[PDB]
Enzyme design. Structure first.
Site, PDB file in Angstrom:
ATOM      1  N   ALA A  70       0.832  -1.204   0.000  1.00  0.00           N
ATOM      2  CA  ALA A  70       0.000   0.000   0.000  1.00  0.00           C
ATOM      3  C   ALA A  70       0.874   1.265   0.000  1.00  0.00           C
ATOM      4  O   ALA A  70       1.979   1.258  -0.546  1.00  0.00           O
ATOM      5  CB  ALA A  70      -0.939  -0.010   1.205  1.00  0.00           C
ATOM      6  N   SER A  71       0.398   2.348   0.604  1.00  0.00           N
ATOM      7  CA  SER A  71       1.196   3.574   0.626  1.00  0.00           C
ATOM      8  C   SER A  71       2.621   3.462   1.191  1.00  0.00           C
ATOM      9  O   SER A  71       3.393   4.401   1.047  1.00  0.00           O
ATOM     10  CB  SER A  71       0.469   4.684   1.379  1.00  0.00           C
ATOM     11  OG  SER A  71      -0.446   5.348   0.543  1.00  0.00           O
TER      12      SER A  71
END
Length: 246
Positions: A50-51
């Protein structure tokens, strides 16, 4: 588990319980070459980054000349994204703090799948898998473990990947969060939806002291909507529990 190290196990359940979450915690003491980890299973299981992956996304972008320390500005379409912080002119530094996904996405598209896949292999990031430039780091094709995160974060910090010294420093500033006592905190959150009302959260980074550097990674799963924030809070309470970061 880097060659020439030792591992220690501890229980931090209660810190995870506070957020109705379950997950893992990996901490690495450079000087003591010691790993302190809670929940070995989670700490060795891979998940979509993810981020958290934006750190390396940003590094490739700089190394390619796609952006520079001085010019990284990127005007926004006009797309009304679900988050008001994405809906404005972004900057490398603003995109990171805000996890303005479109910024790095349009950054990954400029580089291309061929150069992208090559990269994941060049730094051996997790399983190294890839789907499409737009979401390989979110859809679950690319996965890395909390333990793998710590080891590669150290390779980045130390620059064992031998990238231009300038770009490393640039990515370092993009994620530097605070500075207390005599310690500097750097980190990055990550949030993913795993089903339904069950989200996943990431918080990786490191603490720089006057004579040491601590690398950490926390991965969680629970009913907290903002899993990235909850995972940061968890890592932070634990960090403050072992006196590593006030």
């Amino acid at each position: 588990f880097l060659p020439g190290t030792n591992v220690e196990y501890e229980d931090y359940s209660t810190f995870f319980d506070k957020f109705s979450a379950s997950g893992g915690f990996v901490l690495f003491n450079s000087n003591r070459k010691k790993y302190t980890i809670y929940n070995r299973k989670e700490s060795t299981s891979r998940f979509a980054p993810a981020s958290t992956y934006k750190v390396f996304s940003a590094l490739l972008a700089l190394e390619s000349g796609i952006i520079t320390k001085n010019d990284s500005h990127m005007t926004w379409d006009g797309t009304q994204y679900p988050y008001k912080e994405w809906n404005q002119d972004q900057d490398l530094f603003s995109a990171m703090s805000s996890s303005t996904t479109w910024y790095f996405q349009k950054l990954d598209r400029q580089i291309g799948e061929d150069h992208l896949r090559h990269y994941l292999k060049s730094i051996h990031y997790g399983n190294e898998d890839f789907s499409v430039p737009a979401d390989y780091w979110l859809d679950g094709s690319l996965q890395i473990s909390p333990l793998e995160q710590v080891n590669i974060l150290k390779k980045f910090y130390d620059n064992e990947f031998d990238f231009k010294q300038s770009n490393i420093e640039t990515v370092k500033d993009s994620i530097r969060l605070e500075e207390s006592n005599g310690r500097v905190l750097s980190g990055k959150t990550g949030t993913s939806v795993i089903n339904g009302e069950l989200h996943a959260g990431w918080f990786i980074g490191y603490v720089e002291t006057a004579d040491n550097t601590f690398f950490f990674a926390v991965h969680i799963q629970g009913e907290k909507r903002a899993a990235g924030s909850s995972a940061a809070e968890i890592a932070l309470s634990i960090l403050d529990k072992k006196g590593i970061y006030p």
